[PDB]
């Protein structure tokens, strides 16, 4: 008993299908928690970054009658088992290295939360990393195949308290804003949240 | 959704190992390379590390549907492992290709597939004059690995250069893209290949 | 002893994605870290390369059997991909964990699972005073990643230090291990965590 | 018109070497040297990039050209059929295959597999700076199938693929197949060995 | 040949996760290491990069057949993923093992299996005196990870040293191989292990 819910939640479920529903796009809440700026290649213009990626959305195919399943309040599912935002780091110059277990938490109302810790390298102008002005990196994320009307990317207060106390670099400033733009190819507009970080070398 | 019984259909009698050529008609795939950055240049070993968007599109007749039978379904985002994809290859690459974006293609209700993966790969290139005013010239040659002219028709299309990183140790002196058809030792037929030629020099 | 129709049974109605709880009964997993070596210390980027032996054990009620019905079968060696395993995570790790040993767990006839993977992983750590007599102190924090206190109860147990390599550029000034319960920004609940604190200094 | 794939993979086990009574499967092997990436003089290794040209005949893979109209050949994933389990006896790194792992199959069952590969080999690169140059022996051969199961035959090695620029110039190249017995393994195992002699330009 | 309806049979009621033991009869596996090369030595981190042939053989009673019912079939080349294989582990390795050859073992008509992987792996080792005449001594310890003495009996056998590379920055001062049995902190039973000890020094 108890987890005959997994048998159910994955019965007629195709993880390749964005769980939208007539007119209304699936809205995914995105937020980036900067944890550390590992390195800066001044010669090739890249930053090695470690961060928490906070994503949540609602999959209507994934809800259940809390009755029929007694104590089951939430379930920990493998992201390979359900649909997940196909977010992409636009300016990344390296495959993303996901450091935590690829599990997602699912609510009895179908609310999903996937919170992977990641290390990835981005293309960035790290010129003034030694000036008082510092260097500014723009970490741009957004769905890769779903446009505004299919997947609505919404941001939400970026956390900065995870930032490592020691660390060769100090955070001069941080901002996060979502945008919508058209691309050479692809007819529709694409929403994207961009985490902008300004940092300088301590001392 | 509610109407994605379309995926169940699109993959029913579908073998992704089968090039969708419809009799006496080679599948024509449109190819274009958007140079984003020239990461490094190994002058000692003659290689360039390059990052680029790869724009490919073609038509899979097995993948079309009656827009009626499936109400609001205009297009679908499918895993490239689920359908046939051009077996393009970097003839002069000296490293496996590292695909940076989600491996998904967009499929039209008329069977038009689009696949734009961002890739980082190293190529064999004579980077001698990367410091001269002439600059170094790298030829990134791509082409279908096992399908010849009559099976897969590689067509190019205006290469985009606006994606190029503004900062970056290197500046783009020149860029050209042209498709060709050749004969190779072995393989009876001729194979088409689009070659992106880039000339760049170190700024300052 | 042949009669391994037990594996057929142990994996019949078994979903490894399901944490083996039982109403108001969290699965308690015993965790312990045996430090084997401190490979390197990046003073520039603040990281430590560490090789350790994680000792984990817990009870999966779905995995017990009547020792009668299966004669000589005392225990079984199963692939961790075949059963539920604590989704422990290195909270301060800056690299994917590289597991060096076969990913097999041992299972008791009473459902007691043992899993002791040897691992090499890099952690974020202030390795400033690695040359001072005080030494540097690294905190290796582990904890479930998706299950809170009431679902998975992380319990520690005497950390072993005898595995530490005799030679090695570094000597162990001190070691402590303690479990805690904290709340995080997001996730409404408490997630227990055992933290292995190591203080080491460069020999000579 | 590809119900041929459905057929070609029906009662087909890619783990079974396509032999017949007292008839070893003969695979034609040839290496096209494309580039000598690097040379570690301290550890004695060469980084090499090359085209491997393999062909053989799989009798399970032929069809009546009639029953399948225009189908002259098919491009199949090597995971779908049997492929020589060749190994680089002296490689010190896993092989990195750079091209799509697809093979071409004839209507008569003739298979062709041409994978571009980058791999590192153990080699005495001492005299890479002398006029004599360094000589590397790239030895390949079936890993589990002996002479009577898999007959490795060589064939004129191509050298025109060699990169014009490149820190190194090709002083000499030879390719020869051999048969030997090893410590263990009762039977003799054949192997084609590509020997390259190169020196640093200038 | 062919008559490979033998593979269909050999894998019918076969679970590769089941050690082919049998009531008071541990499966005995013969292990031997052929040192081919000592790639590098990190004196700062105390590690050795090594390339070796691991020679393993054992008997799987589930894998035998009536040589009659299958005419010319003397032996078969099977993928190790298809049958049970000793879960040997390099107790003191600090890197995942990189297997360089095709992962196939050969199987006798009497059930005798032979796996012969070539491997490159890094081990924790005190490479202090690699420049002294005494040389450095590395102990490569292997052993089953989850099966104790009574389940899997590890037996050694004359280590081969003729595979050692003639050139190479290092020369072999000495080589010895011996199996042992111990009891460990945890795990009730005793576990057997073969340890390849190599002493080498820098040439010249
Ligand atoms: C489903 O929920 C309804 C109310 O929302 C409840 O009346 C019903 O009993 C539930 N299903 C069952 C029978 O478990
Ligand atoms: C479900 O998730 C949503 C997310 O906002 C939350 O509001 C709600 O309280 C959660 N509880 C359940 C079980 O629905
Ligand atoms: C499309 O589907 C409709 C179903 O009502 C029908 O007219 C017919 O089967 C199809 N015709 C096309 C291809 O437009
Ligand atoms: C255990 O299983 C056996 C069947 O082999 C059954 O007869 C017995 O009642 C069960 N309980 C005991 C006695 O352990
Ligand atoms: C396994 O069962 C034994 C009795 O057979 C019990 O005492 C022990 O606590 C259990 N767990 C282990 C393997 O320690
Ligand atoms: C080939 O096929 C034709 C008709 O499909 C048949 O009549 C003929 O006997 C076949 N020949 C072969 C290859 O045996
Ligand atoms: C093994 O082979 C013999 C061959 O005559 C056959 O009778 C039977 O399958 C096996 N032996 C017996 C008599 O059980
Ligand atoms: C096959 O049988 C022989 C005896 O004929 C025996 O030594 C061993 O089990 C097998 N030989 C091999 C492959 O070592
Ligand atoms: Cl298959 C495919 C089609 C289009 C795209 C483009 C749409 C968004 C914005 C740029 C890139 N991601 C990416 N992939
Ligand atoms: Cl899917 C998901 C939900 C919540 C979490 C959070 C809970 C624990 C503490 C921080 C992180 N791990 C991580 N992942
Ligand atoms: Cl299996 C196979 C057969 C032939 C080929 C050839 C087709 C393209 C052009 C030369 C080479 N690559 C590639 N692969
Ligand atoms: Cl499973 C197995 C058994 C034997 C062998 C050996 C036979 C040929 C020659 C050396 C190596 N390849 C390799 N693998
Ligand atoms: Cl699941 C499990 C049980 C026991 C062990 C230990 C027993 C042998 C000796 C150390 C390690 N291998 C490792 N894993």
The 3-state secondary structure of chain B reads CCCCCHHHHHCCCCCCCCCCCCCCCCEEEEEEEEEEEEEEEECCCCEEEEEEEEEEEEECHHHCCCCCCCCCCCEEEEEHHHCCCCCEEECCECCCCEECCCCEEEEECCCEEEECCEEEEEEECCCCCCCCCCCEEEEEEEEECCCCCCCEEEECCCCCCCCCCCCCCEEEEEEEEEEEEECCCCCCCCEEEEEEEEEEEECC
Q: Which residues line ligand 10 (CB under 6 A)?
A: A 103-105, 113-115; C 145-146, 184, 187, 191
Characterize D46-68 residue by residue with b for buried, 16 or more Cβ atoms within 10 angstroms of its Cβ, and e for exposed. Answer: bbbbbbbbbbbbbebbebeeeeb
CB of C122 closer than 8 Å to CB of A111? no
Q: Apex CA C91: angle with CA A56 and CA C195, to 5°?
A: 140
- Residue C191, Cα to own-chain centre: how many angstroms? 15
CB–CB contacts below 8 A, A to B = 71
| Encoded tokens for B98 | 């590292």
Resolution of the structure in the document, Å: 2.8
Q: Apex CA B190: angle with CA B184 and CA B191, to 5°?
A: 90
Rounded-to-integer distance, Cα C36 and Cα E123, Å = 12
Closest by CA to A71, choosing from C58, C86, C19, is C19
Question: For chain D, which chains pass the contact test of at least 3 CB pairs under 8 Å?
Answer: B, E
Backbone torsions φ then ψ of A63, nearest 5 degrees: -115, 160
**D-chain residues near B45 (CB < 8 A):** 37-38, 167
CB of A119 closer than 8 Å to CB of A50? yes
Strand-pair partners of E119: E52, E99
Under an 8 A CB cutoff, do A164 and C124 touch?
Answer: yes
Give C78→chain E minimum CA distance, Å: 7
Closest by CA to E95, choosing from B100, D84, C49, is C49
CB of E82 closer than 8 Å to CB of E23? no
Strand-pair partners of D40: D45
Rounded-to-integer distance, Cα D67 and Cα D78, Å = 24
Q: Is E107 in the pocket of ligand 12 (CB under 6 A)?
A: no
Mutate to test the pocket of ligand 8, among E73, E108, E114, E157 (most ligand atoms within 8 A of CB): E108
Point out the residue among D15, D19, D86 whose CB comes nearest to the CB of E78.
D15
Tell me how the structure was determined: X-ray
Rounded-to-integer distance, Cα A77 and Cα A55, Å = 15
Closest by CA to B152, choosing from B194, B120, B99, is B194
Residue D20 is classified by DSSP as: B
Interface of C with A (CB under 8 A): 15, 17-19, 21-24, 44-47, 87-90, 93-96, 124, 126, 128, 145-147, 185-187
Backbone torsions φ then ψ of C61, nearest 5 degrees: -60, -30
Sign of CA dihedral D49, D55, D56, D61: positive
Range of the domain at C81: 1-204
Under an 8 A CB cutoff, do C23 and A164 touch?
Answer: no
CB–CB contacts below 8 A, A to C = 73
Rg of chain E, C-alpha, whole Å? 19
Under an 8 A CB cutoff, do D167 and B19 touch?
Answer: no
Asked whether C and A share 3 or more beta-carbon pairs under 8 angstroms, the answer is yes
Segment (H or E) for D55: strand D45-57
Neighbours of D129 (CB within 10 A): 13
Whose C-alpha lies nearest to ligand 5, atom 7?
A: C110
Q: Is C110 in the pocket of ligand 5 (CB under 6 A)?
A: yes
Closest by CA to B108, choosing from B87, B152, B77, is B77
Rounded-to-integer distance, Cα B56 and Cα B85, Å = 9
Point out the residue among E79, E101, E106 whose CB comes nearest to the CB of D87.
E101
Rounded-to-integer distance, Cα A17 and Cα B10, Å = 13
Neighbours of A109 (CB within 10 A): 11
Using DSSP's 3-state secondary structure scheme, residue C69 falls into: coil
* C-alpha of residue A111 to centroid of ligand 2, in Å: 6
Question: For chain E, which chains pass the contact test of at least 3 CB pairs under 8 Å?
Answer: C, D
**E-chain residues near D21 (CB < 8 A):** 1, 71-72
Instruction: Let me know if D187 is exposed, middle or buried by CB neighbors in 10 A (0-12, 13-18, 19+).
Output: middle
B36 conformational bin, left if phi > 0, alpha if psi -120 to 50, beta if neither: alpha
Neighbours of D30 (CB within 10 A): 20
Segment (H or E) for C10: helix C6-10
Which residues fall within 8 angstroms of residue E34, CB to CB, at 6 or more apart?
E52, E53, E54, E55, E159, E160, E161, E163
Q: What is the count of structural domains for chain D?
A: 1
Rounded-to-integer distance, Cα D202 and Cα E156, Å = 52
Question: For chain C, which chains pass the contact test of at least 3 CB pairs under 8 Å?
Answer: A, E
**D-chain residues near B18 (CB < 8 A):** 2, 5
Alpha helices in D97-158 (DSSP H): none
| Encoded tokens for C194 | 């055992």
User: In terms of residues, how long is chain A?
Assistant: 203
**A-chain residues near B37 (CB < 8 A):** 45, 93, 123
D129 conformational bin, left if phi > 0, alpha if psi -120 to 50, beta if neither: alpha
| Residue B136: CATH number of its domain | 2.70.170.10
Rounded-to-integer distance, Cα B71 and Cα E13, Å = 48
**E-chain residues near D43 (CB < 8 A):** 39-40, 169
Strand-pair partners of B143: B89
B23 conformational bin, left if phi > 0, alpha if psi -120 to 50, beta if neither: left
Which residues fall within 8 angstroms of residue E196, CB to CB, at 6 or more apart?
E33, E35, E139, E140, E141, E142, E159, E175, E177
């Amino acid at each position: 008993f108890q987890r005959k819910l997994y048998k159910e939640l994955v019965k007629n479920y195709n993880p390749d299908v964005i769980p939208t529903q007539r007119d209304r796009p699936v809205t995914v809440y995105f937020s980036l928690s900067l944890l550390q700026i590992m390195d800066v290649d001044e010669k090739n213009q890249v930053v090695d970054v470690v961060f928490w990626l906070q994503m949540s959305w609602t999959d209507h195919y994934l809800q259940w009658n809390v009755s029929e399943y007694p104590g089951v309040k939430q379930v920990s599912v493998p992201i390979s088992s359900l649909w997940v935002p196909d977010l992409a780091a636009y300016n990344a110059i390296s495959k993303p290295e996901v450091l935590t277990p690829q599990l997602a938490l699912v609510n009895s109302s179908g609310h999903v939360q996937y919170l992977p810790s990641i290390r990835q390298r981005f293309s960035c102008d790290v010129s003034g990393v030694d000036t008082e002005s510092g260097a500014t990196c723009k970490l741009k994320f957004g769905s890769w195949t779903h446009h505004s009307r299919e997947l609505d990317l919404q941001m939400q207060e970026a956390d900065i308290s995870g930032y490592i106390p020691y660390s060769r670099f100090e955070l001069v400033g941080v901002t996060q804003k979502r945008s919508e733009r058209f691309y050479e190819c692809c007819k529709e507009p694409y929403p994207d949240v961009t985490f902008t970080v300004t940092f300088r070398k301590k001392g």
